[PDB]
Amino acid sequence: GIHSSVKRWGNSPAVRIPATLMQALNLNIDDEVKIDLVDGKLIIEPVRKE
Amino acid sequence: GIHSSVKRWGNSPAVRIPATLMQALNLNIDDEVKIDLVDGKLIIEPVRKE
DNA sequence: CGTGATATATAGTGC
DNA sequence: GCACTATATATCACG
Numbered sequence: 222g223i224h225s226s227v228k229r230w231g232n233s234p235a236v237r238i239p240a241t242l243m244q245a246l247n248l249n250i251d252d253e254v255k256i257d258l259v260d261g262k263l264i265i266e267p268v269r270k271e
Numbered sequence: 272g273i274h275s276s277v278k279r280w281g282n283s284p285a286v287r288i289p290a291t292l293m294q295a296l297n298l299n300i301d302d303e304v305k306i307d308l309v310d311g312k313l314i315i316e317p318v319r320k321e
Numbered sequence: 322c323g324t325g326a327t328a329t330a331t332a333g334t335g336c
Numbered sequence: 337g338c339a340c341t342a343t344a345t346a347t348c349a350c351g
Contacts, residue, residue, distance in 0.1 A: 225303075231331080234288045238277070239326085254277055261316075266312040282325050283326050331342100332342090336339080
C-alpha cells in the first residue's frame with residue numbers, strides 16, 4: 222500500500238491513519254481503539270462505547 | 272490490551288502508540304509499518320527496511 | 322478548492 | 337517526573 226511513515230507526536234509516536242480509511246471502518250475522532258498484542262503485531266480494533 | 276483515544280493530529284487522525292509499546296516490539300520513530308486491513312481492523316506491523 | 326497530512330509546541334494529569 | 341493525553345496552528349500536498 223502507501224509507504225506512510227510513523228512520525229513523533231510531541232513525545233510519543235502516533236500511527237497516522239488516512240481519514241479516508243477511517244470512514245471505511247466507520248469510526249471518528251476520540252474513538253477508543255483497543256491495542257491488543259496478537260501474532261507479535263499491533264491489532265487495532267475500534268471499540269464503540271454503546 | 273490498552274485502549275487509546277484516536278485524537279486529531281492537525282487534520283488527520285492518529286493512533287497514539289505509547290513508548291512502552293515501542294520498546295516491546297523494539298520499534299522506534301520514523302519507521303515504516305504495514306497498514307493492513309484484516310478482520311475489519313487495522314493491522315499494524317513494523318516492517319523494518321534493513 | 323477543500324481537507325487530509327506533516328511538523329510542532331504546551332499545559333496538564335495520571336501512572 | 338516522565339510518559340501520556342488533549343489541543344491548536346501554519347502550510348502544503350493531494351484529491
